Write a protein that holds these residues in place. Structure first.
Motif, short mmCIF file in Angstrom:
data_model
loop_
_atom_site.label_atom_id
_atom_site.label_comp_id
_atom_site.label_asym_id
_atom_site.label_seq_id
_atom_site.Cartn_x
_atom_site.Cartn_y
_atom_site.Cartn_z
N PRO A 98 41.37 8.30 -0.92
CA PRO A 98 40.50 8.90 0.10
C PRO A 98 41.03 8.64 1.51
O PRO A 98 41.45 7.55 1.84
CB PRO A 98 39.17 8.17 -0.10
CG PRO A 98 39.54 6.87 -0.73
CD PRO A 98 40.75 7.14 -1.58
N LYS A 99 41.00 9.64 2.35
CA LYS A 99 41.49 9.45 3.75
C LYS A 99 40.61 8.43 4.47
O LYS A 99 41.08 7.66 5.28
CB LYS A 99 41.44 10.79 4.49
CG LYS A 99 42.42 11.77 3.85
CD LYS A 99 42.46 13.06 4.67
CE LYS A 99 43.36 14.08 3.97
NZ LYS A 99 44.76 13.91 4.44
N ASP A 100 39.34 8.42 4.17
CA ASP A 100 38.43 7.45 4.84
C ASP A 100 37.38 6.96 3.84
O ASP A 100 37.37 7.37 2.69
CB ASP A 100 37.73 8.13 6.02
CG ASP A 100 36.93 9.33 5.51
OD1 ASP A 100 36.86 9.50 4.31
OD2 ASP A 100 36.41 10.06 6.34
N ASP B 277 34.12 10.92 2.65
CA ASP B 277 34.84 12.21 2.80
C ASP B 277 33.90 13.26 3.38
O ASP B 277 32.69 13.09 3.39
CB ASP B 277 35.36 12.67 1.44
CG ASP B 277 36.84 12.31 1.30
OD1 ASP B 277 37.17 11.17 1.55
OD2 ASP B 277 37.61 13.19 0.95
#
Length: 66
Positions: free
Chosen positions: A5-7, A10
């Motif tokens: 996950p980017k952060d 999501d």
């Protein structure tokens, strides 16, 4: 995209105008469009009816995004 996950959270929040589908309530199987969610907990979807279009506020748990 990337498996990780980017952060922490999501962009699951659906944009306005996107199509949504209901999975609970007699309106199950009906598509609706985000007219304007008051918050991430509750959202406003539009239910199109052969007779006329109606607006109803449903919880994100009461319905799901396509």
């Amino acid at each position: 995209g990337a498996m990780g996950p980017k952060d922490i959270v999501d962009p699951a929040t659906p944009y306005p105008g996107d199509k949504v589908i209901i999975t609970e309530g007699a309106f199950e199987g009906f598509q609706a469009i985000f007219t304007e969610p008051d918050g991430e907990a509750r959202s406003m979807l539009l239910l199109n009816l052969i007779n006329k279009e109606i607006k109803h506020s449903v919880k994100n748990t009461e319905f799901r995004k396509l």
